[PDB]
Amino acid sequence: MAPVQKQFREFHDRIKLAQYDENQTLRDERDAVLTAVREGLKKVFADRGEAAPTFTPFNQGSYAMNTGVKPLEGGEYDIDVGIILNIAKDDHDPVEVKKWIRDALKDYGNGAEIRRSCVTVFKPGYHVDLAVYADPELSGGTLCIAKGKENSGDEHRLWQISDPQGFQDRIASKLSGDDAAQFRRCIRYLKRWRDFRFSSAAPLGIGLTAAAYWWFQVSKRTDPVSQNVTYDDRDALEQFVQTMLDNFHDTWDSKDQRSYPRLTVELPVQPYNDVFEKMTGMQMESFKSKLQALLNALKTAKSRLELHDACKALADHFGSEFPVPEK
Ligand SMILES: Nc1ncnc2c1ncn2[C@H]1C[C@H](O)[C@@H](COP(=O)(O)OP(=O)(O)OP(=O)(O)O)O1
Ligand SMILES: Nc1ncnc2c1ncn2[C@H]1C[C@H](O)[C@@H](COP(=O)(O)OP(=O)(O)OP(=O)(O)O)O1
Ligand SMILES: [Mg+2]
Ligand SMILES: [Mg+2]
């Protein structure tokens, strides 16, 4: 039966996006937005009659963790950055804090918008999500992110304990060397699957990343004699996807009077929230179906005599950058 490891490795080379520490361009676009916020803030606070708050920025998201993928045509890069303002949380509404950042970014690119967990600034072919934190020193020693929107009620405006560094560290440290490499490749493969089969409803990147933290297992073989190591990414995805499917739980929804299959995946650090909690029952059901059809293709791919047929089965789920050799 035809193997597909070479094709997976090539697919990986095509989809991977270099992380911040190796991506001049990303750093520059990041540093530009941070620059705009400092410059912007000087204005917003010259109005108020108070000293501009200072912030310490740090890298977040898949570009910090080396799990980033290139977007498909008409998709956007997602530059995630955190800013820790020299402010005490208990003295400020978090939404009001997010307003400062929005207003400081009013003019920059196609402007800024306040989301539930970040301020997002738009630009040609990318966006920057700024997660906004209060200083742990002035806030009694916890790092809290500014949660809530402009239209959000009172009980939905809050400073939620977070641990982005802890999360990144667990992703980096779960494995090492070529084992960790396979883990990162498998997250990327599933992010392209997400981009290909889900609408611009989609299994978040955070979700698949946390899922992998809990459930990914390396697939490699070590020759008993030569101790030569080869990796089997197809098999790694098969076991990982099967394990995710096994952890779906039929969950009754009283309002709708039916159950939906739901996958719950806790963040392995504070606040230990279910990273999929925002997906609806119906989007979860569709997510489970598509995971099952991906699993079936991963199995099909291992029992094809012809490389063409093995790859084509994979391309139907991973999309047209998955290499299909001619028959
Ligand atoms: N639901 C959540 N719960 C807890 N932390 C989150 C959640 N969503 C996002 N975060 C934090 C951790 C993420 O690595 C970071 C950026 O989120 P996001 O950009 O959605 O994921 P990501 O950068 O790993 O994947 P992607 O490659 O798909 O952009 O913010
Ligand atoms: N704890 C977290 N830390 C950092 N980023 C987070 C966290 N939780 C979610 N995010 C990310 C994921 C999203 O890409 C982005 C916006 O969060 P989200 O809660 O989806 O906003 P939202 O409620 O505006 O979404 P929508 O507009 O679709 O309803 O921030
Ligand atoms: Mg991201
Ligand atoms: Mg993001």
What is the DSSP annotation of 219-285?
A: -EEE-TTT--EEE-HHHHHHHHHHHHHHTEEEEEETTTTEEEEEE--B-SSTT--BTTTTS-HHHHH
Round to whole Å and give the CA distance between 18 and 184.
Answer: 12
Cβ pair 308, 186 in contact under 8 A: no
* Nearest ligand to residue 129 Cα: 4
Residue 144 counted as an annotated binding residue:
no
- DSSP state string for 83-125: EEES--GGGS-HHHHHHHHHHHTSSSTT-EEE-SS-EEEEETT
Q: What's the 316 CA to ligand 2 centre distance in angstroms? A: 30
**Of 143, 206, 272, which is best to mutate to test ligand 1, by the most ligand atoms within 8 angstroms of its C-beta?**
206
Please give the Cα distance from 108 to 27 (Å, whole number). 17
Rounded to whole angstroms, how far apart are CA atoms 255 and 244? 26
Q: Is 116 in the pocket of ligand 2 (CB under 6 A)?
A: yes
**Domains of the chain, CATH where assigned:** 20-162 (3.30.460.90), 167-318 (no CATH)
Ligand 2 pocket check for 162: Cβ under 6 Å: yes
Instruction: State both tokens at 308.
Output: 């063409």
User: Tokens at residue 184, please?
Assistant: 């990162």
Resolution of the entry in angstroms:
2.2
Q: How far is CA 3 from the centre of its chain?
A: 29
